[PDB]
Design a protein around this ligand. Structure first.
Ligand SMILES: *OP(=O)(O)OC[C@H]1O[C@@H](n2cnc3c(N)ncnc32)[C@H](O)[C@@H]1O
Lengths: 152, 76, 989, 80
């Protein structure tokens, strides 16, 4: 069963939480969903925090976990609903060996360095390539209007 | 008379849906009390397909029955 | 396709239409042999009703051929089944292509075999004597096969063939690099450019190191423009077969080992002894008669040693015990063995008819004597096996009446009623499994019969389409055996239906037989059987492959599903890796299916319902859908009533979806001018997109156009018919309609760079009012996509779209096998392999019913008919796992009583730690955590005093219903790893 | 047994490819090699020799593999 491995991974991760992740916890009713706060360390995203939900499919680890950004984040790789296209999560590259810590690290890297090659929103990539400054303005406005209270 | 309803969104229990009226009229109330459109996921009552315009009450829903639904379509 | 043209024109002859001949004829009729000819003038007796499914009790004292002809003809209406009531003569054998002599005397076998080998007619002589089979095939002196292996020709992608004179060619790195060999012919199907190399003679290749592939002389040809698909050509192989009267002395047997070859030689000696005995005394040996067995073994002892290999010294003598056992149980014919051997014989007949696959090299002997009682048990007695006029006389002549009672007391379960399910139902009905007042049967299936199912089905007729599959299968099974009581159930055996199939349901069942079509279903059913400790019989076929396994509790290893394949069954393939980077044609067809689903289905429920319910284009991804739906056809300021049979409504979509977009992305993101990381390194990975010229000579692009037009006419009610020979002139009369609508297709209405939502409220209001106007009309019912209707070319639309897009992206086109690999007319099953696996499962059912048997009695089977591959091996022992003092297998479980008052969580943990000597670090029921050693002391002090049932009720929010015998919850321990898995804890209530 | 031997593994599509294994290597090693070469998950198939399947944990030297011995690869079947 996937739940045993998920609980083991969460228990191991709580001991030494990643620096960009805090208050990572799961409800005892359903231990296959994780709630965590993402703390990017690169402007303009460093003004606030981001809350995301990690959902493990019943046949984990043979199927990749599902990651969705619960909060509203302005990003070329993140759709409005919040789904993200990580290279590791994609079934063409997913392997059962990779635990969730590598997935979270890749997510943080993607947030810091966007995958401009294949965005889920083409217009955002076009704006970023043609005029990075306007993208900076709009991203700062969005992360100020929707950014969750960032802790220390 | 109650119907046990569980949803993958989170904690769920018996909703306002009653067997007296078709679920087509109950779509408005379930969407209002869930915040997520029914178009996202298709209900699977005990391994049986469901449709908006198909009254399910004539297919033998025993008292205190159960309803299931799963994530559908592509994410993107 | 060419093979199926020969089958419909073939003629075969089946002699001795007993149980075996009936099975062969049924398989031939299902496969579609054009014209059979049944030949059996002997009257029906009681001893042949235990294996033949076409003869009833009322057909006694009547010719078997005539009695079976009615049911065989009604089995399939495209087969001209006739009965030959005369005698076999040379002019008769001249007409037929294949003759089969099932259970015919040795004299008749030799006579017909000599006559057929004299006239170049393929000959088969199958025969079943109890629990041992025999097959012999002789396909003439010079028989040439054309498709030696059940495999598609190899395909690869070429990229650079610049080097010339040795014909050096390079191809992409992968398995195809080493797949090709030296002594093989390779043919280039055809690519754009290099007309010299297209449709040329096959050219032998040479494999060189570092990927070099030598083609030969190609410098004098044209210049290499672009790479394409390369296919292989199979080399026909000629096989020579000895005549029967010559092959008797030197049996070239098919086997996988020297021991199996010796076993087959001993079986051959036993069969020859039986034939000689029948020649001498004129009667088959009596059932389990010691004197007849001694006579047969004495005949085998004095049988000519030249019957074996003359040149090889007789290192060891024949097994006296094996020959005696064969003689003892040689007076009956059994349904499972008949099914298996008839499947193999019909496959050989199809090999001879269609000239595909490698024909069986003469003899093949199948041994299934393990189904007899163990050496320490009580073997059947001659008085027990006495015939008493029941339909199971042939089975009693091998097992005895007590075994028949044991069979009929059983109450079994059959999950799934597909092809293997129907064949297993036939085997159960003929064998007599639960055909009494104490037993019964249960068929669990959800699906309904459709046209594409009953093509090669046995129990389903033409008028049963749309009825429940379980109900029709139950009616057919009750028809086969009147005493059988079958209870059809429609609710699937799925985790959502564990209340129906709970402890009260699984208490009655004595075993489970699974004929499922997915790995997830098999895994769930095996989990349920392991939970309830029920015998499980599982079979699975693919093409000519087949497996048949039995998983007895605490005897054989539990089912281990291929979790990778089970996960891949439901594959949410990301669109993020298919929009721009199609690796293979599979990606192209996946994208085509996705766009078809997006355009033809999701639009119906969002055009009116979504707008009328809530939201708008601002807070939803509506504008893209509206942009792709509104101007593609044309507004015309009036209600759309134009017929789809026009160039504009199809060629415009073709150019917009396959030329305009790719040109726009090329001019926006040039492959060599991508601004990535400042200096690009590998921009444009392995693919440079480029639209092709509008070549009207290619009819492939017109197929997609006509498919789209017909699909729209069908979905919107627009008029349209088969105007293939009438509307072509009109279609070609407008070659350039694109410039007439330059402005609408250029960029929205007025845009240069689109700024940041330059359309504004003025265009948004126009879009909203256009949506409101279009929302008035006939309702569009959300009808589900039907892939069964091949006449309207649904799958053809997707295939054409995939082919054109892959040609656009320089990807090899989709082949027939690639098309059938997906839900677009998925590969159907073959009757022969289905019957074979069902027969092996029936052979296993004999041992399961027989009661307590060791692991060595049971056998797992795996067969490949296209290359005469078959293995029966005893299964592995349970995998014992160890952890300190506790040692367990995959069947073991922990049972802890809750007591008259329910113990608290701390009491349960203390009981576990004392009784089993393990410390619980994590204890969770399902996916709800109940206790963790890493919890803060306050949380542990909060959770421990509560009762386990109360804790579950508090967490999951649902109290257990009455009848919850056990709560099953898993646990972990301190100091272990993630590799170990402790047995589930059955918390008894 | 210092000299490694070369054996043949039969693909399900009738193709045989030469491998290079040691008798000390367990069947897991050969299974991983053939899984990587054929692009099939090592849990989706099992490989047999002389009619009897090969266990993952035993060394290849137990099964008596000779040089140029064909080891068949059997898939796990889904349809039914
Ligand atoms: O001929 P076939 O290979 O398609 O047979 C498979 C049959 O199995 C039914 N099926 C599939 N899965 C289930 C479950 N979980 N429960 C009950 N029946 C099931 C299909 O109807 C199919 O015919």
């Amino acid at each position: 069963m996937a739940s045993m491995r998920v609980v083991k991974e969460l228990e191991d991760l709580q001991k030494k939480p990643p620096p960009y992740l805090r208050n990572l916890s799961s409800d005892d009713a359903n231990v296959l969903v994780w709630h965590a706060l993402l703390l990017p360390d690169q402007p303009p995203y460093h003004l606030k925090a981001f809350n995301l939900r990690i959902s493990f499919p019943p046949e984990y680890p043979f199927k990749p976990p599902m990651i969705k950004f619960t909060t509203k984040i302005y990003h070329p790789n993140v759709d409005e609903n919040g789904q993200i296209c990580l290279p590791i999560i994609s079934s063409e590259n997913w392997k059962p060996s990779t635990k969730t810590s590598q997935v979270l690290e890749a997510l943080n890297v993607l947030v810091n360095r966007p995958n401009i090659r294949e965005p889920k929103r083409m217009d955002l990539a076009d704006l970023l390539t043609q005029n990075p400054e306007l993208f900076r303005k709009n991203a700062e406005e969005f992360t100020l209007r929707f950014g969750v209270d960032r802790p220390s | 008379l109650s119907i046990l309803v569980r949803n993958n969104k989170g904690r769920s229990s018996t909703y306002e849906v009653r067997l007296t009226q078709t679920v087509a009229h109950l779509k408005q109330q379930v969407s209002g009390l869930e915040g997520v459109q029914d178009d996202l996921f298709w209900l699977t009552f005990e391994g049986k397909p469901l449709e908006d315009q198909l009254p399910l009450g004539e297919y033998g829903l025993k008292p205190l029955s159960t309803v299931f639904m799963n994530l559908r379509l592509r994410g993107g | 396709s060419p093979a199926m043209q020969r089958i419909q024109g073939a003629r075969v002859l089946v002699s001795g239409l007993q149980g075996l001949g009936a099975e062969v004829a049924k398989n031939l009729v299902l496969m579609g042999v054009g014209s059979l000819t049944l030949h059996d003038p002997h009257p029906t007796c009681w001893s042949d009703l235990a294996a033949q499914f076409l003869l009833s009790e009322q057909d006694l004292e009547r010719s078997r051929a005539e009695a079976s002809q009615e049911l065989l003809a009604q089995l399939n209406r495209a087969v001209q089944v006739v009965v030959h009531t005369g005698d076999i003569t040379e002019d008769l054998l001249l007409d037929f292509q294949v003759v089969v002599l099932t259970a015919a005397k040795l004299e008749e076998q030799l006579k017909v075999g000599t006559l057929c080998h004299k006239h170049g007619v393929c000959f088969l002589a199958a025969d079943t004597r109890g629990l041992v089979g025999q097959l012999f095939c002789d396909f003439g002196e010079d028989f040439t096969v054309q498709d030696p292996t059940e495999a598609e020709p190899l395909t690869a992608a070429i990229q650079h063939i610049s080097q010339g004179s040795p014909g050096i060619l390079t191809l992409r790195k992968g398995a195809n690099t080493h797949y090709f060999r030296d002594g093989d012919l390779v043919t280039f199907s055809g690519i754009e450019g290099m007309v010299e190399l297209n449709d040329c003679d096959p050219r032998s290749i040479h494999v060189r190191e570092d990927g070099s592939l030598e083609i030969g002389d190609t410098t004098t040809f044209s210049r290499y423009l672009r790479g394409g698909a390369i296919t292989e050509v199979k080399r026909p192989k000629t096989v020579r077969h000895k005549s029967l009267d010559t092959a008797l002395l030197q049996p070239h047997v098919v086997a996988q080992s020297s021991q199996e070859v010796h076993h087959a030689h001993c079986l051959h000696q036993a069969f020859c002894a039986l034939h000689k005995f029948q020649h001498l005394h004129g009667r088959p040996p009596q059932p389990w008669d010691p004197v007849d067995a001694e006579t047969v073994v004495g005949l085998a002892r004095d049988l000519e040693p030249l019957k074996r290999t003359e040149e090889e010294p007789l290192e060891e003598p024949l097994d006296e015990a094996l020959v005696r056992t064969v003689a003892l149980s040689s007076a009956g014919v059994l349904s499972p063995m008949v099914a298996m051997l008839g499947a193999v014989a019909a496959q050989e007949v199809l090999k001879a008819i269609s000239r595909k696959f490698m024909p069986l090299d003469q003899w093949l002997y199948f041994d299934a004597l393990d189904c007899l009682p163990e050496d320490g048990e009580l073997l059947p007695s001659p008085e027990d096996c006495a015939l008493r006029g029941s339909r199971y006389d042939g089975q009693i002549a091998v097992f005895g009446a007590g075994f028949q009672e044991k069979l009929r007391r059983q109450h079994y379960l059959l999950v799934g009623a597909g092809a293997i399910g129907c064949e297993l139902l036939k085997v159960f009905a003929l064998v007599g499994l639960g055909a009494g007042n104490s037993g019964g049967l249960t068929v669990v299936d959800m699906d309904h019969i459709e046209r594409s199912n009953l093509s090669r089905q046995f129990l389903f007729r033409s008028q049963d389409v749309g009825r429940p599959k379980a109900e029709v299968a139950a009616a057919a099974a009750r028809g086969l055996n009147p005493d059988l009581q079958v209870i059809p159930l429609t609710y699937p055996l799925d985790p959502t239906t564990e209340h129906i199939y709970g402890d009260n349901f699984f208490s009655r069942v004595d075993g489970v037989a699974a004929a499922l079509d997915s790995f997830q279903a098999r895994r769930y059913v095996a989990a349920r059987c392991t939970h309830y400790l029920k015998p499980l019989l599982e079979a699975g076929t693919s093409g000519t492959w087949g497996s048949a396994t039995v998983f007895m509790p605490h005897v054989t290893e539990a089912y281990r599903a291929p979790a990778s394949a089970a996960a891949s069954e439901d594959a949410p393939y990301p669109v993020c890796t298919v929009r721009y980077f199609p690796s293979t044609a599979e990606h192209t067809l996946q994208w085509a299916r996705h766009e078809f689903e997006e355009l033809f289905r999701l639009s119906a429920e969002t055009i009116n319902h979504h707008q009328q319910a809530h939201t708008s284009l601002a807070d939803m991804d509506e504008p893209q859908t509206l942009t792709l739906l509104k101007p593609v056809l044309g507004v015309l300021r009036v209600r759309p009533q134009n017929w789809q049979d026009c160039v504009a409504w199809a060629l415009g979509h073709w150019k917009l979806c396959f030329h305009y977009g790719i040109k726009q992305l090329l001019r926006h993101f040039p492959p060599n001018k991508v601004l990535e990381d400042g200096t690009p390194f590998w921009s444009g990975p392995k693919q440079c997109p480029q639209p092709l010229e509008f070549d009207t000579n290619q009819d492939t692009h017109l197929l997609y156009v006509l498919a789209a037009a017909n699909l729209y006419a069908q979905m919107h009610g627009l008029p349209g018919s088969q105007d293939w020979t009438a509307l072509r002139e009109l279609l070609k009369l407008l070659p350039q309609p694109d410039p007439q609508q330059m402005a609408p297709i250029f960029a929205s209405n007025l845009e240069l760079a689109s700024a940041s939502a330059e359309f504004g409220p003025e265009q948004q209001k126009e879009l909203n009012k256009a949506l409101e106007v279009w929302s008035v009309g006939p309702p569009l019912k959300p009808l589900m996509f039907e892939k069964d209707d091949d006449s309207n070319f649904h799958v053809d639309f997707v295939v054409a779209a995939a082919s054109l897009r892959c040609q656009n992206y320089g990807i090899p086109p989709v082949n027939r096998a690639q098309s059938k690999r997906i839900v677009g007319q998925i590969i159907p099953a073959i009757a022969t392999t289905t019957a074979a696996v069902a027969g092996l499962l029936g052979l296993e059912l004999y041992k399961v019913v027989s009661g307590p048997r060791p692991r060595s009695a049971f056998r797992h089977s795996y067969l490949h008919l296209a290359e005469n591959y078959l293995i029966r091996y005893m299964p592995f022992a349970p995998a014992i796992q160890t952890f300190h003092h506790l040692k367990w297998t995959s069947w073991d479980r922990l049972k802890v009583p809750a007591g008259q008052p329910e113990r608290t969580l701390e009491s349960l943990l203390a009981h576990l730690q004392e009784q089993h000597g393990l410390r619980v670090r994590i204890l969770l029921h399902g996916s709800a955590l109940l206790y963790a050693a890493g919890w803060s002391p306050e949380k542990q002090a909060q959770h421990l005093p509560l009762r386990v049932t109360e804790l579950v009720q508090q967490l999951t929010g649902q109290a257990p219903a009455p009848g919850q015998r056990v709560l099953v919850l898993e646990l972990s321990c301190e100091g272990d790893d993630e590799d170990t898995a402790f047995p589930p804890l059955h918390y008894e209530l």
